Short mmCIF file of C-alpha atoms and ligand atoms in Angstrom, two decimals:
data_model
loop_
_atom_site.label_atom_id
_atom_site.label_comp_id
_atom_site.label_asym_id
_atom_site.label_seq_id
_atom_site.Cartn_x
_atom_site.Cartn_y
_atom_site.Cartn_z
CA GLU S 1 -26.08 -9.71 29.55
CA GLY S 2 -24.46 -12.81 31.23
CA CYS S 3 -21.26 -10.66 31.35
CA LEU S 4 -22.23 -8.59 34.37
CA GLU S 5 -22.91 -11.68 36.52
CA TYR S 6 -19.63 -13.30 35.51
CA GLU S 7 -17.86 -10.04 36.33
CA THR S 8 -19.45 -9.94 39.72
CA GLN S 9 -18.60 -13.50 40.56
CA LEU S 10 -15.04 -13.15 39.31
CA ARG S 11 -14.59 -9.95 41.29
CA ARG S 12 -15.77 -11.65 44.48
CA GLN S 13 -14.08 -15.09 44.03
CA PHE S 14 -10.68 -13.57 43.37
CA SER S 15 -10.93 -10.34 45.34
CA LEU S 16 -10.35 -8.30 42.20
CA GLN S 17 -10.24 -4.54 41.87
CA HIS S 18 -11.69 -4.37 38.30
CA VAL S 19 -13.01 -6.97 35.84
CA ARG S 20 -14.40 -6.95 32.37
CA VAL S 21 -15.86 -10.02 30.69
CA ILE S 22 -16.49 -9.71 26.91
CA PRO S 23 -19.35 -11.51 25.03
CA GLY S 24 -18.18 -14.89 23.63
CA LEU S 25 -17.61 -15.54 19.84
CA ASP S 26 -13.10 -12.25 16.89
CA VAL S 27 -11.99 -12.84 20.47
CA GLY S 28 -8.37 -11.42 20.67
CA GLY S 29 -9.34 -8.21 18.90
CA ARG S 30 -12.26 -7.78 21.22
CA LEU S 31 -10.09 -8.47 24.29
CA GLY S 32 -7.83 -5.56 23.29
CA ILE S 33 -10.87 -3.25 23.07
CA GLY S 34 -12.03 -4.38 26.47
CA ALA S 35 -8.63 -3.94 28.08
CA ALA S 36 -8.00 -0.55 26.37
CA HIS S 37 -11.34 0.67 27.71
CA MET S 38 -10.55 -0.48 31.26
CA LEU S 39 -7.13 1.21 31.04
CA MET S 40 -8.78 4.48 29.81
CA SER S 41 -10.78 4.68 33.02
CA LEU S 42 -7.94 3.64 35.27
CA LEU S 43 -5.12 5.83 34.12
CA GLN S 44 -4.77 9.55 35.07
CA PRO S 45 -2.78 12.02 32.95
CA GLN S 46 1.00 11.57 32.89
CA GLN S 47 0.80 8.25 34.73
CA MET S 48 3.08 5.37 33.84
CA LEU S 49 1.94 2.07 32.30
CA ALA S 50 4.10 -1.00 32.42
CA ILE S 51 3.53 -3.38 29.57
CA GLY S 52 4.22 -7.04 28.92
CA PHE S 53 4.55 -8.64 25.50
CA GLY S 54 2.21 -10.96 23.56
CA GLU S 55 -0.75 -10.65 21.25
CA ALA S 56 -3.34 -9.50 23.74
CA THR S 57 -1.16 -6.78 25.20
CA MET S 58 -0.08 -5.61 21.74
CA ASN S 59 -3.68 -5.40 20.62
CA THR S 60 -4.56 -3.45 23.71
CA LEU S 61 -1.73 -0.98 23.04
CA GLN S 62 -3.06 -0.30 19.59
CA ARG S 63 -6.50 0.56 20.85
CA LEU S 64 -4.95 2.76 23.58
CA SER S 65 -2.54 4.74 21.37
CA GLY S 66 -4.71 7.82 21.09
CA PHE S 67 -5.33 7.88 24.87
CA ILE S 68 -1.64 7.41 25.49
CA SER S 69 -0.80 10.59 23.41
CA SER S 70 -3.46 12.88 24.63
CA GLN S 71 -3.12 11.93 28.25
CA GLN S 72 0.69 11.75 27.94
CA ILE S 73 0.93 8.26 29.35
CA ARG S 74 4.47 7.04 29.84
CA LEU S 75 5.13 3.39 28.83
CA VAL S 76 7.71 1.04 30.19
CA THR S 77 8.58 -2.57 29.31
CA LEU S 78 8.34 -5.19 32.03
CA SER S 79 10.74 -7.64 30.30
CA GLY S 80 13.65 -7.64 27.93
CA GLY S 81 13.27 -8.76 24.29
CA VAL S 82 12.72 -5.43 22.54
CA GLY S 83 11.53 -6.92 19.25
CA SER S 84 8.59 -8.55 20.94
CA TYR S 85 7.18 -5.08 21.87
CA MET S 86 7.52 -3.51 18.40
CA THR S 87 4.14 -4.42 16.87
CA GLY S 88 2.50 -2.58 19.80
CA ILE S 89 4.96 0.25 20.11
CA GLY S 90 5.01 1.01 16.26
CA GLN S 91 1.32 2.01 16.59
CA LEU S 92 2.17 5.05 18.72
CA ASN S 93 3.29 8.48 17.57
CA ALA S 94 6.99 9.39 18.13
CA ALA S 95 6.50 12.01 20.92
CA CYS S 96 5.22 9.20 23.23
CA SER S 97 7.52 8.39 26.14
CA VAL S 98 8.63 4.72 25.86
CA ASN S 99 11.22 3.23 28.13
CA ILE S 100 12.55 -0.13 26.86
CA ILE S 101 14.77 -2.60 28.69
CA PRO S 102 17.82 -2.85 26.46
CA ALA S 103 18.42 -6.53 26.73
CA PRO S 104 17.25 -9.91 25.64
CA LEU S 105 14.22 -11.50 27.32
CA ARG S 106 16.28 -14.52 28.43
CA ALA S 107 20.07 -14.87 28.84
CA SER S 108 21.93 -18.12 27.90
CA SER S 109 22.76 -18.47 31.65
CA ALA S 110 21.80 -17.16 35.03
CA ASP S 111 25.23 -15.62 35.52
CA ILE S 112 24.78 -13.64 32.31
CA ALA S 113 21.26 -12.64 33.40
CA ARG S 114 22.58 -11.33 36.70
CA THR S 115 25.35 -9.47 34.84
CA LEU S 116 22.84 -7.87 32.54
CA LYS S 117 20.47 -6.89 35.39
CA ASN S 118 23.36 -4.95 36.93
CA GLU S 119 24.24 -2.91 33.87
CA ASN S 120 23.22 0.68 34.55
CA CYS S 121 21.01 1.13 31.50
CA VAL S 122 19.07 -2.08 32.30
CA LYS S 123 18.85 -1.49 36.06
CA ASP S 124 17.41 1.99 35.45
CA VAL S 125 14.50 0.65 33.40
CA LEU S 126 13.87 -2.22 35.82
CA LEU S 127 13.30 0.35 38.52
CA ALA S 128 11.06 2.54 36.39
CA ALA S 129 8.94 -0.55 35.57
CA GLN S 130 8.53 -1.49 39.16
CA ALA S 131 7.39 2.08 39.91
CA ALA S 132 4.61 2.13 37.30
CA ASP S 133 1.08 3.13 38.30
CA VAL S 134 -0.66 0.36 36.26
CA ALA S 135 0.54 -2.82 34.49
CA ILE S 136 -1.03 -4.70 31.55
CA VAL S 137 0.18 -8.28 30.96
CA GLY S 138 -0.84 -11.38 29.07
CA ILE S 139 -1.01 -14.84 30.56
CA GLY S 140 0.36 -17.98 28.91
CA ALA S 141 -0.79 -21.55 29.69
CA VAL S 142 1.30 -24.77 29.54
CA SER S 143 -1.82 -26.34 28.11
CA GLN S 144 -1.39 -24.25 24.90
CA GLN S 145 1.68 -26.36 24.11
CA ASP S 146 3.13 -25.29 20.68
CA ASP S 147 0.60 -22.55 20.26
CA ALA S 148 1.89 -20.56 23.33
CA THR S 149 3.51 -17.28 22.37
CA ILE S 150 6.54 -17.93 24.54
CA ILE S 151 7.21 -21.05 22.46
CA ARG S 152 6.27 -19.56 19.04
CA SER S 153 8.68 -16.75 19.74
CA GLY S 154 11.51 -19.15 20.43
CA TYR S 155 12.08 -18.21 24.07
CA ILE S 156 11.78 -21.76 25.54
CA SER S 157 12.12 -25.08 23.82
CA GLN S 158 9.63 -27.88 23.54
CA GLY S 159 11.71 -29.99 25.91
CA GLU S 160 11.69 -27.14 28.42
CA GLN S 161 7.97 -26.72 28.19
CA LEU S 162 7.44 -30.47 28.80
CA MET S 163 9.66 -30.35 31.87
CA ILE S 164 8.04 -27.10 33.11
CA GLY S 165 4.70 -28.90 32.85
CA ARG S 166 6.12 -31.99 34.65
CA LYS S 167 7.19 -29.79 37.50
CA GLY S 168 3.56 -28.68 38.03
CA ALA S 169 3.50 -25.31 36.23
CA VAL S 170 0.18 -24.30 34.70
CA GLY S 171 0.94 -20.92 33.19
CA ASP S 172 3.26 -17.94 33.08
CA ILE S 173 3.56 -14.13 33.13
CA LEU S 174 6.62 -12.83 31.31
CA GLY S 175 8.35 -16.22 31.40
CA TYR S 176 7.77 -16.76 35.14
CA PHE S 177 5.83 -19.98 35.54
CA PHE S 178 3.46 -20.78 38.45
CA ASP S 179 1.55 -23.80 39.69
CA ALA S 180 -2.22 -24.24 40.02
CA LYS S 181 -2.24 -22.56 43.39
CA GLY S 182 -0.44 -19.51 41.96
CA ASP S 183 2.94 -20.19 43.45
CA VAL S 184 6.00 -19.61 41.32
CA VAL S 185 7.68 -22.86 40.44
CA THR S 186 11.07 -22.87 42.18
CA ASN S 187 13.21 -25.53 40.33
CA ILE S 188 12.97 -24.15 36.79
CA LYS S 189 16.20 -22.70 35.41
CA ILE S 190 14.64 -20.19 33.02
CA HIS S 191 13.49 -18.09 35.96
CA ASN S 192 17.03 -17.08 36.87
CA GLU S 193 17.81 -16.42 33.16
CA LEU S 194 15.08 -13.76 32.60
CA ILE S 195 16.19 -10.20 32.56
CA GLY S 196 13.00 -8.55 33.54
CA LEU S 197 11.20 -7.90 36.80
CA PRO S 198 10.24 -10.96 38.77
CA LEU S 199 6.64 -11.56 39.65
CA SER S 200 7.35 -10.57 43.27
CA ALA S 201 8.44 -7.09 42.09
CA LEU S 202 5.56 -6.85 39.66
CA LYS S 203 3.29 -6.78 42.75
CA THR S 204 4.67 -3.42 43.73
CA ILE S 205 2.51 -1.94 40.93
CA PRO S 206 -0.90 -1.21 42.48
CA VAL S 207 -3.17 -2.03 39.62
CA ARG S 208 -2.18 -5.07 37.58
CA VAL S 209 -4.39 -6.02 34.67
CA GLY S 210 -4.27 -9.42 32.95
CA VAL S 211 -5.84 -9.69 29.50
CA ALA S 212 -6.24 -13.24 28.34
CA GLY S 213 -8.82 -15.61 26.91
CA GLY S 214 -9.51 -19.07 25.46
CA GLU S 215 -10.80 -21.91 27.65
CA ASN S 216 -7.40 -23.52 27.44
CA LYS S 217 -6.06 -20.58 29.59
CA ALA S 218 -8.67 -20.93 32.38
CA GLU S 219 -6.49 -22.79 34.81
CA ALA S 220 -3.59 -20.47 34.21
CA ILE S 221 -5.69 -17.29 34.60
CA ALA S 222 -7.22 -18.55 37.87
CA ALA S 223 -3.78 -19.39 39.18
CA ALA S 224 -2.47 -15.94 38.15
CA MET S 225 -5.16 -14.33 40.31
CA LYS S 226 -4.65 -16.74 43.21
CA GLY S 227 -1.00 -15.83 43.21
CA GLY S 228 -1.83 -12.15 43.22
CA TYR S 229 0.14 -11.32 40.15
CA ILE S 230 -2.89 -9.66 38.60
CA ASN S 231 -5.66 -7.92 40.56
CA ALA S 232 -7.77 -7.03 37.55
CA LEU S 233 -8.84 -9.13 34.58
CA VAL S 234 -10.12 -8.77 31.08
CA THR S 235 -11.34 -12.03 29.56
CA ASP S 236 -14.17 -13.62 27.49
CA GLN S 237 -17.41 -15.27 28.59
CA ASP S 238 -16.50 -18.89 27.93
CA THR S 239 -13.18 -18.52 29.71
CA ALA S 240 -14.85 -16.78 32.66
CA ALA S 241 -17.26 -19.69 32.96
CA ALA S 242 -14.33 -22.08 32.89
CA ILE S 243 -12.35 -20.17 35.47
CA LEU S 244 -15.30 -20.02 37.83
CA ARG S 245 -15.72 -23.83 37.64
CA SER S 246 -12.00 -24.49 37.99
CA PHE W 1 33.62 31.28 -7.78
CA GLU W 2 32.54 27.79 -6.25
CA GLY W 3 28.93 26.94 -4.99
CA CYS W 4 27.35 23.64 -3.85
CA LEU W 5 27.60 21.92 -7.25
CA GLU W 6 31.37 22.56 -7.37
CA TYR W 7 31.72 21.41 -3.79
CA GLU W 8 29.92 18.21 -4.63
CA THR W 9 32.14 17.56 -7.68
CA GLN W 10 35.32 18.23 -5.66
CA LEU W 11 34.25 16.12 -2.69
CA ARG W 12 33.26 13.26 -5.02
CA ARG W 13 36.66 13.25 -6.76
CA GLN W 14 38.79 14.04 -3.75
CA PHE W 15 37.39 11.28 -1.53
CA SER W 16 36.26 8.90 -4.35
CA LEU W 17 32.65 8.94 -3.26
CA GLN W 18 29.80 7.21 -4.98
CA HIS W 19 27.18 9.89 -4.15
CA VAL W 20 27.33 13.34 -2.55
CA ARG W 21 24.89 16.12 -1.73
CA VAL W 22 25.83 19.51 -0.42
CA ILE W 23 22.92 21.69 0.79
CA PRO W 24 23.11 25.52 0.75
CA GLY W 25 24.25 27.41 3.96
CA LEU W 26 21.46 30.10 4.18
CA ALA W 27 15.85 27.28 7.05
CA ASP W 28 17.78 25.46 9.93
CA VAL W 29 20.41 22.84 9.08
CA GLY W 30 19.87 19.51 10.92
CA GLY W 31 16.32 19.36 9.49
CA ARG W 32 17.48 20.32 6.02
CA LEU W 33 20.30 17.67 6.24
CA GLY W 34 17.63 15.15 7.03
CA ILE W 35 15.58 16.13 4.05
CA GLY W 36 18.58 15.92 1.76
CA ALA W 37 19.73 12.55 3.11
CA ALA W 38 16.23 11.13 2.83
CA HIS W 39 16.13 12.28 -0.77
CA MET W 40 19.47 10.60 -1.52
CA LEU W 41 18.36 7.39 0.19
CA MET W 42 15.13 7.45 -1.81
CA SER W 43 17.07 7.31 -5.02
CA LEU W 44 19.37 4.53 -3.83
CA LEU W 45 17.07 2.05 -2.19
CA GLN W 46 15.12 -0.49 -4.24
CA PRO W 47 11.94 -2.09 -2.97
CA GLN W 48 12.41 -4.60 -0.11
CA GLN W 49 16.08 -3.66 0.37
CA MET W 50 17.61 -3.42 3.76
CA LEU W 51 18.84 -0.15 5.35
CA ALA W 52 21.23 -0.31 8.32
CA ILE W 53 20.82 2.73 10.60
CA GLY W 54 22.97 4.40 13.19
CA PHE W 55 21.77 6.74 15.94
CA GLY W 56 22.06 10.47 16.54
CA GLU W 57 20.09 13.52 15.50
CA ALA W 58 20.94 13.66 11.84
CA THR W 59 20.10 9.97 11.28
CA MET W 60 16.88 10.20 13.31
CA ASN W 61 15.79 13.27 11.31
CA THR W 62 16.57 11.43 8.12
CA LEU W 63 14.46 8.43 9.13
CA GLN W 64 11.52 10.62 10.07
CA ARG W 65 11.57 12.10 6.56
CA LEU W 66 11.94 8.66 4.94
CA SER W 67 9.10 7.06 6.85
CA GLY W 68 6.51 7.24 4.06
CA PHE W 69 9.02 5.74 1.60
CA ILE W 70 10.10 3.04 4.02
CA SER W 71 6.43 2.04 4.32
CA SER W 72 5.53 2.00 0.56
CA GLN W 73 8.71 0.39 -0.60
CA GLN W 74 8.78 -2.15 2.27
CA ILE W 75 12.33 -1.23 3.26
CA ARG W 76 13.66 -3.38 6.12
CA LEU W 77 15.50 -1.50 8.85
CA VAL W 78 18.23 -2.85 11.05
CA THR W 79 20.20 -1.18 13.88
CA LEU W 80 23.99 -0.94 13.58
CA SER W 81 24.46 -0.55 17.33
CA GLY W 82 22.91 -1.42 20.67
CA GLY W 83 21.07 1.12 22.78
CA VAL W 84 17.51 0.54 21.68
CA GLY W 85 16.18 3.85 23.08
CA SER W 86 18.67 5.90 21.09
CA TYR W 87 16.70 4.81 17.97
CA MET W 88 13.12 5.50 19.17
CA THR W 89 12.67 9.09 17.98
CA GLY W 90 13.37 7.72 14.48
CA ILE W 91 11.56 4.39 14.39
CA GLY W 92 8.67 5.74 16.58
CA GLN W 93 7.55 7.61 13.43
CA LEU W 94 6.94 4.50 11.34
CA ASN W 95 3.79 2.43 11.00
CA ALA W 96 3.52 -0.97 12.65
CA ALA W 97 3.72 -3.05 9.41
CA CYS W 98 7.35 -1.73 9.13
CA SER W 99 10.07 -4.38 9.43
CA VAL W 100 12.51 -3.22 12.19
CA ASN W 101 15.36 -5.37 13.46
CA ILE W 102 16.89 -4.00 16.73
CA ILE W 103 19.96 -5.14 18.61
CA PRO W 104 18.52 -6.14 22.05
CA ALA W 105 21.44 -4.87 24.06
CA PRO W 106 23.03 -1.77 25.47
CA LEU W 107 25.22 0.41 23.24
CA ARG W 108 28.19 0.02 25.57
CA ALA W 109 28.84 -2.68 28.20
CA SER W 110 30.58 -1.96 31.55
CA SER W 111 33.52 -4.16 30.52
CA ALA W 112 34.94 -5.81 27.43
CA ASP W 113 34.26 -9.29 28.78
CA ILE W 114 30.62 -8.31 29.16
CA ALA W 115 30.48 -6.92 25.61
CA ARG W 116 32.01 -10.13 24.19
CA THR W 117 29.43 -12.18 26.16
CA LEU W 118 26.52 -10.12 24.81
CA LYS W 119 27.84 -10.32 21.22
CA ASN W 120 27.67 -14.13 21.54
CA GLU W 121 24.03 -14.25 22.77
CA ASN W 122 21.90 -15.77 19.91
CA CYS W 123 19.42 -12.90 19.73
CA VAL W 124 22.30 -10.32 19.46
CA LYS W 125 24.48 -12.27 17.01
CA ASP W 126 21.52 -12.77 14.58
CA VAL W 127 20.97 -9.01 14.37
CA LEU W 128 24.71 -8.23 14.09
CA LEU W 129 24.74 -10.48 11.02
CA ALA W 130 21.60 -8.98 9.60
CA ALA W 131 23.18 -5.53 9.93
CA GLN W 132 26.35 -6.49 8.18
CA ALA W 133 24.27 -7.91 5.28
CA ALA W 134 22.43 -4.61 4.60
CA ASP W 135 22.25 -3.02 1.14
CA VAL W 136 22.76 0.53 2.38
CA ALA W 137 23.75 2.19 5.61
CA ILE W 138 22.95 5.60 7.05
CA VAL W 139 25.17 6.98 9.91
CA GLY W 140 26.06 10.27 11.67
CA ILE W 141 29.60 11.38 12.42
CA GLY W 142 30.61 12.84 15.83
CA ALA W 143 33.62 15.03 16.34
CA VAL W 144 35.94 15.34 19.39
CA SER W 145 36.02 19.04 18.79
CA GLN W 146 32.24 19.27 19.67
CA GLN W 147 33.24 18.55 23.30
CA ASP W 148 30.11 18.61 25.60
CA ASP W 149 27.87 19.18 22.61
CA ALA W 150 28.67 15.76 21.00
CA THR W 151 25.67 13.47 21.00
CA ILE W 152 27.83 10.63 22.42
CA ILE W 153 28.48 12.75 25.55
CA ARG W 154 24.96 14.31 25.76
CA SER W 155 23.53 10.80 25.76
CA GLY W 156 25.81 9.65 28.55
CA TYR W 157 27.65 6.95 26.57
CA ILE W 158 31.13 8.38 27.35
CA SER W 159 32.34 10.59 30.21
CA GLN W 160 34.05 14.02 29.87
CA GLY W 161 37.22 12.34 31.20
CA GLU W 162 37.01 9.70 28.52
CA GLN W 163 36.45 12.25 25.85
CA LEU W 164 39.53 14.17 27.01
CA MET W 165 41.74 11.12 26.89
CA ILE W 166 40.30 10.01 23.54
CA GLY W 167 41.31 13.45 22.20
CA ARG W 168 44.77 13.11 23.75
CA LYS W 169 45.27 9.81 22.03
CA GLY W 170 44.77 11.45 18.63
CA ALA W 171 41.07 10.74 17.79
CA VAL W 172 39.11 13.36 15.82
CA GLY W 173 35.74 11.74 15.54
CA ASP W 174 33.66 8.66 15.65
CA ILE W 175 30.98 6.58 14.00
CA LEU W 176 28.84 4.56 16.42
CA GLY W 177 31.31 5.02 19.31
CA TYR W 178 34.36 3.87 17.29
CA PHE W 179 36.89 6.72 17.22
CA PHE W 180 39.44 7.32 14.47
CA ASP W 181 42.38 9.64 14.02
CA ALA W 182 42.81 12.29 11.27
CA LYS W 183 44.07 9.72 8.67
CA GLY W 184 40.91 7.70 9.20
CA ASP W 185 42.41 4.93 11.28
CA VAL W 186 40.58 3.55 14.31
CA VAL W 187 42.41 4.46 17.44
CA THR W 188 43.71 1.27 18.99
CA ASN W 189 44.38 2.00 22.67
CA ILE W 190 40.84 3.13 23.65
CA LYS W 191 38.81 0.80 25.87
CA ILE W 192 35.36 1.97 24.80
CA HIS W 193 35.99 0.07 21.49
CA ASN W 194 36.01 -3.34 23.04
CA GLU W 195 33.00 -2.49 25.18
CA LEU W 196 30.65 -1.60 22.28
CA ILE W 197 28.05 -4.18 21.32
CA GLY W 198 27.41 -3.22 17.72
CA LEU W 199 29.24 -3.89 14.49
CA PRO W 200 32.83 -2.61 14.31
CA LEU W 201 33.77 -0.18 11.57
CA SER W 202 35.60 -2.98 9.68
CA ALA W 203 32.31 -4.93 9.37
CA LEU W 204 30.37 -1.78 8.46
CA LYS W 205 32.53 -1.63 5.29
CA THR W 206 30.81 -4.81 4.05
CA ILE W 207 27.74 -2.72 3.30
CA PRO W 208 28.13 -1.53 -0.31
CA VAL W 209 26.69 1.94 0.03
CA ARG W 210 27.51 3.79 3.29
CA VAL W 211 25.99 7.30 3.63
CA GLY W 212 27.26 9.72 6.28
CA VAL W 213 24.92 12.60 7.08
CA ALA W 214 26.62 15.38 9.12
CA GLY W 215 27.18 19.07 9.22
CA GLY W 216 28.74 21.91 11.15
CA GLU W 217 32.22 23.19 10.59
CA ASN W 218 33.43 21.69 13.82
CA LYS W 219 32.83 18.24 12.21
CA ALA W 220 34.91 18.95 9.11
CA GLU W 221 38.05 17.15 10.29
CA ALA W 222 36.05 14.17 11.52
CA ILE W 223 34.03 13.86 8.27
CA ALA W 224 37.17 14.01 6.15
CA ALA W 225 38.75 11.32 8.33
CA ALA W 226 35.66 9.16 8.07
CA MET W 227 35.91 9.25 4.30
CA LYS W 228 39.65 8.69 4.36
CA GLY W 229 39.14 5.57 6.38
CA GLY W 230 36.47 4.36 3.99
CA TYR W 231 33.73 4.11 6.63
CA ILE W 232 31.39 6.16 4.44
CA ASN W 233 31.53 6.27 0.65
CA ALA W 234 28.74 8.81 0.29
CA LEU W 235 28.08 12.11 2.10
CA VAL W 236 25.28 14.52 2.77
CA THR W 237 26.52 17.82 4.23
CA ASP W 238 26.14 21.56 4.19
CA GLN W 239 28.02 24.23 2.20
CA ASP W 240 30.20 25.63 4.95
CA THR W 241 31.15 22.21 6.11
CA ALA W 242 31.98 21.03 2.56
CA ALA W 243 34.27 24.06 2.15
CA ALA W 244 36.07 23.28 5.38
CA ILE W 245 36.34 19.59 4.58
CA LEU W 246 37.92 20.45 1.24
CA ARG W 247 40.61 22.67 2.90
CA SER W 248 41.30 20.03 5.70
O1 LIG I 301 -1.03 -15.52 24.58
P1 LIG I 301 -0.52 -14.04 24.42
O2 LIG I 301 -1.58 -13.01 24.61
O3 LIG I 301 0.07 -13.89 22.96
O4 LIG I 301 0.65 -13.72 25.40
C1 LIG I 301 0.88 -14.43 26.58
C2 LIG I 301 2.41 -14.39 26.88
O5 LIG I 301 2.42 -13.19 27.55
C3 LIG I 301 2.41 -13.57 28.98
O6 LIG I 301 2.95 -12.57 29.97
C4 LIG I 301 3.29 -14.74 29.04
O7 LIG I 301 4.70 -14.64 28.71
C5 LIG I 301 2.77 -15.50 27.96
O8 LIG I 301 3.82 -16.35 27.73
O1 LIG I 302 25.84 14.54 15.84
P1 LIG I 302 24.64 13.55 15.59
O2 LIG I 302 24.05 13.57 14.26
O3 LIG I 302 23.56 13.75 16.74
O4 LIG I 302 25.23 12.05 15.85
C1 LIG I 302 26.55 11.76 15.81
C2 LIG I 302 26.72 10.52 16.72
O5 LIG I 302 26.18 9.47 16.06
C3 LIG I 302 27.51 9.02 15.16
O6 LIG I 302 27.60 7.72 14.38
C4 LIG I 302 28.44 8.86 16.27
O7 LIG I 302 28.09 7.97 17.38
C5 LIG I 302 28.26 10.18 16.78
O8 LIG I 302 28.80 10.13 17.98
#
C-alpha cells in the first residue's frame, strides 16, 4: 500500500528506470523475490545478466534460476573472487551459461591487479561483463562496519575500512567505494587492486539494478543512485523512507 | 582367454595399483567410464572426506554421476588446477549446500613470473594447500598422440606448435598440463610447466589415493606412463585400452 508511493517518489527523485519497494518486516529473502521478479520482466530470451556478489544478489539468483534456464539467460561475473559467487551459482542447472572471471577479487598490489587484468582469460570475461544487457549488484555501507559482507569475507581489513570511512566513503559496489554525493573516492588503494570492472565501465550496461536494504544502507544506496551506478532499485519500505529523507 | 577381470588383476599387479576397474568394450565409453569411476569413488570415500578434482571430460562425467553421493555424504571438493570455467560442467550439477573450494586463477599464466606471483596470492595459496591435503583425487590423462583432439588443445590451453614441440621433447601425455615421458618422468625443458598455477605432480602424490579415469587406445602409452611415474595409483579404464596398456 505505502509501497507504490515510495516507488513513485524514488523513481522521480533519482531519475530511475524501475523501482520496487517491498513491505517492511524476513527482509533479505523478500528482497531476492522482489529483485528476481523485476529481472523476470526486464530480461528477454538469451540476454546476458552480469552479477555481483553478496547475500542479496545470491538470493536473487536462487529465485531466478528457473527463469535463467527456460529463457536461456547467460550469466557473467562482474568481479573476481569465484568462491563468493558459488552459493548463487550452485542453485542453477549445469546447462546454464556462466562466465566467471578467473581471478581473485583483490590482488596484493596494483601492479599484480594490472597484470591479472591483462591476462587473456581474464580480459575476455571483463569485456563480456561490460557488454551485458542487465546487471544486478548489492550495495555495501561503511556504516555496517564489521557486519559488511566485504569485511566478513576478508576482502578489506578493519583498519582499511576505518581509513576508507575517514576519507569520506559511504558505501561500495564490488569494492569500489564512493562518497555521499556518489563520487568514487580517489585516494583509496584498494581500487587499483580490484580485478573486476570499474564502476565507470559498469555504466555501459543499460539497466543496472541494485538490491539492498536495512536503514543502515540508506545513505549508501542514495549515493549509489546519485553516482549513476544503478538506475533501478529493489529495497524495503523502511530503507526507502530513510533514503527519501537523506 | 583374458576378459576384464583378468585385465584388472594384471594391471593391479603390473603397476602396483590399489584399485582398478576395467569396463567392457561393447553403450558409449566416456559416459560408462564416468559411471565406473563414480562407483569406485563411492566405495573409497568416507563421509566428510575431501576429493581433489582435475578437469576434462572424463572427470566432469564422473562428478556428474557422483553428485547425489557428494551431497548425502557431505564430500568436500577442491580443484587441483586453476581455470575455474573448466570445472563448471561438473560442479554446476551439484546442489548449493555442497562444499566446493576453487582455485581463483587461470590454469596457465602468460609467463612463469606471473604464475609464481599468483601462486603466492593468499587466496590461491590457501586452496593449493587444501588440494594437497585431500583424501582422494580424481584426474583425467591426456595423450600427445590425440593431437588436435586432446582436451588441453581443444580448450585452448596449449597451441598446436607447443604440442608439436612437447612431443619432440619426448612427452607422451599429461595430467593437469604437466607432461611426462614414457618412463613416467616429468619433462623438464617445457615452459608450460612453470606457467601452470595448480599443484605440481610431485605435490599431487601427497594425496593417498589417486584415481585416473581415461580410455581410448591412443591414451594407452600415456596411462601406462602415468602409473609408472606414480601420479595415479588407481585406474578406471576400458577393455581395449587395458589390453593396449598391458602390451605397452
Ligand atoms: O550486503 P550484501 O547484500 O551481502 O552485499 C553487498 C556487497 O555487495 C556489494 O556490491 C558490495 O561489495 C558490498 O560490499
Ligand atoms: O581427455 P579428458 O578426459 O577430456 O581430459 C584429459 C585432460 O585432463 C587431464 O588431467 C589432462 O589435463 C588432460 O590434458
